[PDB]
Symmetry: D2
């Protein structure tokens, strides 16, 4: 008589289960942690509030936490990123999950609140796993008594870590966190290669546009922008890159891209005259990758070539000024998560108007909104780190420490390099790769143990 | 009446000068420092012992130091890396330089010592610029009193930083140092993209072999291994990668390479039975990139496919067991720095034997030995960092400090990120790239100053 | 849908509005085809034409259908594959009052029924006088079962390599009854569609069907003609380690020089029918096999037994007999993951453990995977192919073969390609769609290389 | 006492021989022909006049013809393409060769005449092997009596075939010819992949410029233009492509290139106003690939970005208007085949002037002029076809036929596809590739013999 969930359609559960079983064979690091720790039950007693895209890959993460002893209550961290068959399979396994593709904003907040509350009162949570910081924020602002009993947060993504570091800096962070994003097997695997796989995937599912021979502009060249730029260049696009960071821009140049600014001389003074109209008028596709605000702004959108595609693969939709478009232009739904925005005016449009832009996922994360986000074998790395991070903070038991000891432990840390390497090793074996073992002489020669770690903590890969 | 030099052919000086004038137009960061600091003369009083490949690019570096006030005495840090027209142009400008392509080991040592000694007595040096640590070693072992006058060392490359760190840990480093290698505009510019440009260059010059369609094995996948693998893959080689570091091996898999070991299951027995003979029997080209010892060992060389090319682009020739090949196999010079190594025995070869390997540059740095090393526009980043590091240590005046201040400053440091970004910006402008300026609101949104630095010190790019 | 219109059969007519929105987008991606619509509309060159059409009922085909109708033609349409229809495209066409019989996921019986519904109107042969085909099935049915109808048909315009082969066989046997245009061998078809279309759509279909990471995995592409070239690139550009098999040494040479290792599934290349002939070590490392040949049983039963566990198997050539799926149906249990995705469990026939690890993933039951698991080629590519189709239909319809006396019929009974000038004109509209600018020769330059300033720019022997 | 030759330095012969021995192992199709036909001596009595770039690869071709029974007299078909060690090795073998790197035009004509005349009288020639048609033209215009006794011409390259067809059309062609260029194992191997290998090779040897991140403009996208554009794109250049043929331009678009014209709207009306100065002012490198005349004209040269590199990889130097540059601008030799062209005037130049272009090889084919042209394993295909073509025309004995029979055979033909395939099979085997054999049922299914040919003559590959 299990009813403690809310999903689009429970009858999709068998299909979700078939895909979970396939995904297990694509996730050797995650499944190796199941096998290694299931006897020991290191998460026995853990009660995890989880807020992360409810995909098939997140289903394997959830069932790994459960197989190691945890109970969980789960929601998605984006209104479009759930795969409904995945949510259905998790609900059908007796796991509380509140998630469906195509939530409204009010439904989004309600789903998170249903994980926090059970039977109308605070659940006895003692761990948090978050992607972007929304659940973390709600707990600090609205449920501080609950954080008193929480041992830690394990945060997935660059934007979430930034929000954690602001709270730490301000003295408002109440529990320690592990920055899962900055493991190498996360940031330089998921953020880069995952977007390489899934950006052109989403754009093809959304539009079925030929990409070869067309012009793209990628805003940002951090890990996501590097992977995005490659997603498009490998399809034959002519890709230009914008950056505020000259080091990242130097990389874009050396990687064979032309580095351009939307603004003359790079000076974003807020005027229409600032816009490089000749450049924007030739762009067929713009992608935002920054985690920053209003990097595809109203004046750029006015100057874009007719029928250009606009999308965002950073965490939040305010990279693009969609608010301006809602206020001024008429939206025509092509199909779910694909809209034509008619720049002819706000009240109605001609069905044969040629002066429109195509917006994907209403500006939300496009790889998850129009496709299925990153593939299982990439998320394997991210999610093995999540499990290791959950084990570490749960075993530390911050909430039970005296106040003076808490003060020594209140920080945002990454996992040790040695664990990062062990995750990577299982990923390499998943491809059939064979890592060589140093001889004792060779290990002495470079100053490392034969077992690693093989690099100093400052190494950038 | 200038005679304080030793080069191959002083009449090459006009040709060297024409190439230096071209190189200046390719090195906007270096030339920007020349313009910015010429008036201040920040290196007036500096007496720099320099040991680094006497290329055209190093000539621009040397003449930037001199233009900022320095005196120098120069040698090359490798017996095959000098460009003789560069050495001549520098000597013809009245600068002491002792360097030619094709030195013997004894001549190499004599050259360093001609920089250290002036008129048979130790020069009154007070600064050191080094690439690989040979000059640094000699000063510490053979001229330790000269280090009483020296304010610091600025070290170019990964292997030399390793050696500095060992002395630091042993208490044997006598003067502070700047690790120039680990600026991002050095390690992730020079070490990776320089080798991408110059590895296939050197193999083409040495052999004129078609690379497309042939099998390569790159040993190592750090920065040099990454750029080398791309040098070969972009020519159409089928590239396999070996690694001892699982994180680097994970990157190779995601970059689209098969990861293999020369040894069965990765276990280096020392026995012939441990060699994967089927794999090595198909390899047309092996390239070592590790900075480690004997990573292309005698049993691997015996197993390689007939007529395979063997080369090393790490800093020292002991990556490849060339001593085994000298002792046991007969060497045929094709032309300078290209030898066929006949596996038929030691006592003479047949001109038409088919069982030989081709060794480039006798196993020394192949891009410098068989071509011209990295191009000017890439060395621009490395050498701008060198100049900044020289100004910083010279101004700190370590040797003039009380012993109390000395212990506090005796360290191996990197340049601050702000300077790294300023170097990157000049490189970007040299491609005609335009970096965007953050608005106040955007800078506040991501927590940075509009002028940078744009990333925390932990960021990996 | 016009009042009283029931002459169609599609999955769901309520998908029509969606299809129409996608048709309007596709028009903006198809400048060559829409340039013909604009150039020839007032002339109505297909007035009186009655075209039986058999080709994948996609959005791209919808723009083709509506261009023919806009030029005067009547049509009756079916798909040439049981999984290639886009149901919203079919609904939009049915809702414009155009007879179409097509949906995604037909049985073989339904497939044949659909073609027959184009041929028969109200239980009697329609008065067709033109044929547009993709693969030769409609052509074969007409020749075998309705020969009298070919008496009124002025020609066939055939889309694809496999269908051209079948026409040339009939021509060689004296059994082709009407002239045909080989649309496939326009350069703006073969070297555009067959190659770049599969580049776009092969990795697309594999992602949609499996969501597998492809970077760092091992692929084997069987064949390296135009489809094999595009397919290999689709996978290599994703980071796959791609090996190529070929029987043609010249195509194999191109694969070597393009940076691929060239291998055979069989020891020394010799396929003697024994298990001992299979290179088991090679096949046991392959994560993905793609067949591209137009040939039979190039991924045979002994290969399927030796493939690495959990490898993906698919076919992007025209017919499903590239892979021995009959063997898998006879011997192994099929698990449907979702439509057009099956796990084939090699442990036995009449059951499988839900957690079995010894299965293969077969996409689209061995049928054209780009069309079965994604949407086939993109509009801007099909633009080339379908502008040639329109030109070819105009040319045979104006030639009026069925009206000529016996004397001029023997003269005109041929299989021909479009002239190069027309190929260039299609290409020029494609280039302009990318915003490309073609340079004009000066008179002295045109004289120097011996062409007119207006072209054609190459001899007919030129290979591009 | 062999003196019937003229080369730069006969003492280079030993080095040239070493490189020939390496090249033989890189040329399996050609050495397969040696082994297959040596006992038959199918060219016994052939006396071949040869005019083609005197490289190591041509040396293997010459000695294959000689091995099959031919005598030859040889010259190069370009003033800068000879490798002097290859010329020396051939002369030292007793083979008449007249060729060196850096001929004047008068020397170039004298060298061809030295092949035509032996001891001041027409040699008893009976075969012609040509590259570009210069020897063919001289024989028709000045030595018609020799052509009465010549059985045929085997012509290497697009431009020479064009010249032959013009003669055939005008009725001035005196002997039949085989178009070697249009074997697939020539045109779609040599013309494309050869230039892919050797264009960036020459540019690096000439300038040592970084290419990644810079802007290139390739004029033409036939086989040479396709391979040249890949040569640059694979180095990270941003490549734009110009074309007059819309089908080739469509291919460039689909291959991921932006297709532009030097002229506004592509109309070359001869006025400076017609030049797209904005576009050309951004180009760092222009490469001509057309076989046409003046496709990099005076107004384009005036408009190119300062310090742009200019080169031609088509057969003749009139693709670039170098005449204009000699008449108006001052030339500064950097090193052989590398010139700065100072656009400040004809009247000398300032050594530090910034307004120059770098011209490679004085506008002659840059891959052979500034490097070594195509690699052995690629030229293997072209030269196995040359050998088969010589055998075919020599055995047909056209000169010995009655006039009515000559009239039936006077044509320009290609080799049969079966031989094209047999050449390709040897090439594939040299890479270790394994071609599959059709079963009888499969061969029946697709309508071919198990032995091939596998494609109809109309197939384009
Ligand atoms: N969709 C996905 O699957 C996915 C995956 C990982 C991360 N993310 C999100 O993507 C965003 C980027 O993450 P990251 O790891 O690449 O961060 P990052 O810090 O490595 O890169 C962001 C880059 O944007 C640049 N940038 C900032 N403002 C800019 C502006 N105005 N114009 C141009 N460039 C600008 C910065 O210089 C930086 O290099 C974050 O929101 C992160 O959470 C999404
Ligand atoms: N030739 C050049 O122009 C040039 C340029 C820069 C640096 N270098 C030299 O190249 C070397 C590498 O420098 P780097 O910056 O890439 O260092 P790095 O530490 O980034 O990379 C070296 C890599 O080798 C791997 N490795 C070590 N031992 C191995 C073994 N037995 N088998 C396989 N892989 C193994 C390590 O795991 C590491 O990833 C150093 O000697 C450095 O000084 C040469
Ligand atoms: N799915 C699509 O969108 C699409 C697009 C165009 C064409 N097609 C179809 O794809 C198929 C191939 O078309 P194409 O234009 O590339 O033809 P093609 O003749 O250019 O190429 C087929 C290749 O297969 C090779 N081959 C034959 N038997 C083989 C074997 N046993 N092993 C290995 N290689 C073998 C041939 O040597 C040839 O090079 C045809 O059925 C055509 O109708 C499909
Ligand atoms: N350097 C080498 O090693 C080498 C190798 C092979 C051939 N070649 C020579 O290279 C040249 C080209 O040979 P190919 O086989 O590529 O010929 P091709 O006919 O395949 O290509 C030449 C191209 O130039 C284009 N073109 C003509 N005039 C033009 C103009 N004004 N602007 C732009 N594009 C224009 C044509 O449309 C055509 O596509 C010939 O001279 C040939 O002999 C040189
Ligand atoms: N061209 C170059 N000059 C100096 N040091 C180098 N290290 C690598 N390439 C170099
Ligand atoms: N999208 C498509 N529509 C019709 N026929 C096709 N053949 C390949 N892709 C196609
Ligand atoms: K996914
Ligand atoms: K250099
Ligand atoms: K499509
Ligand atoms: K060569």
């Amino acid at each position: 008589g299990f009813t403690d969930y809310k999903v689009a359609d429970i009858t999709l559960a068998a299909w979700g289960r078939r895909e979970l079983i396939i995904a297990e064979s694509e996730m050797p690091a995650l499944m190796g942690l199941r096998r290694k720790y299931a006897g020991q039950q290191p998460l026995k007693g853990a009660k995890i509030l989880g807020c992360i895209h409810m995909t098939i890959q997140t289903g394997v993460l959830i069932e790994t936490l459960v197989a190691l002893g945890a109970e969980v209550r789960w929601s998605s961290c984006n209104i479009f990123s759930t795969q409904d068959q995945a949510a259905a399979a998790i609900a059908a396994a007796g796991i509380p999950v509140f998630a469906w593709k195509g939530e409204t904003e009010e439904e989004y907040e309600w789903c998170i609140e249903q994980t926090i509350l059970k039977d109308g009162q605070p659940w006895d949570a003692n761990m948090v796993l978050d992607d972007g910081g929304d659940l973390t924020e709600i707990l600090h602002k609205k449920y501080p008594q609950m954080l008193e009993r929480i041992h830690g947060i394990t945060e997935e993504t660059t934007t979430g870590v930034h929000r954690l570091l602001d709270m730490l800096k301000n003295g408002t962070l109440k529990v320690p966190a592990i920055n899962v994003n900055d493991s190498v097997t996360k940031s330089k695997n998921d953020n880069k290669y995952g977007c390489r796989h899934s950006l052109n995937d989403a754009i093809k599912r959304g539009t079925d546009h030929l990409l070869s021979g067309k012009q793209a502009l990628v805003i940002g060249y951090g890990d996501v922008g590097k992977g995005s730029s490659q997603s498009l260049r490998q399809e034959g696009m002519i890709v230009k890159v914008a950056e505020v960071d000259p080091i990242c821009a130097m990389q874009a140049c050396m990687d064979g891209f032309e580095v351009v600014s939307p603004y003359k001389n790079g000076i974003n003074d807020g005027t229409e005259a600032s816009i490089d109209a000749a450049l924007l008028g030739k762009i067929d596709l713009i992608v935002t990758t920054t985690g920053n605000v209003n990097v595809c702004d109203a004046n750029m959108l006015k100057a874009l070539k007719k029928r250009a595609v606009v999308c965002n693969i950073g965490h939040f939709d305010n990279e693009i000024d969609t608010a301006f478009m809602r206020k001024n232009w008429a939206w025509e739904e092509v199909k779910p998560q694909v809209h034509k925005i008619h720049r002819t005016g706000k009240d109605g449009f001609d069905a044969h108007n040629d002066d429109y832009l195509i917006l994907l996922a209403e500006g939300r994360l496009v790889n998850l909104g129009n496709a299925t986000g990153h593939p299982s074998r990439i998320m394997d790395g991210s999610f093995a780190n999540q499990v290791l991070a959950q084990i570490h903070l749960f075993e530390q038991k911050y909430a039970d420490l005296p106040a003076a000891e808490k003060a020594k432990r209140l920080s945002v840390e990454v996992l040790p390099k040695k664990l990062d390497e062990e995750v990577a090793l299982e990923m390499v074996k998943g491809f059939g790769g064979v890592v060589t073992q140093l001889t004792p002489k060779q290990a002495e020669y470079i100053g490392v143990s034969v077992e690693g770690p093989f690099k100093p903590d400052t190494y950038r890969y």
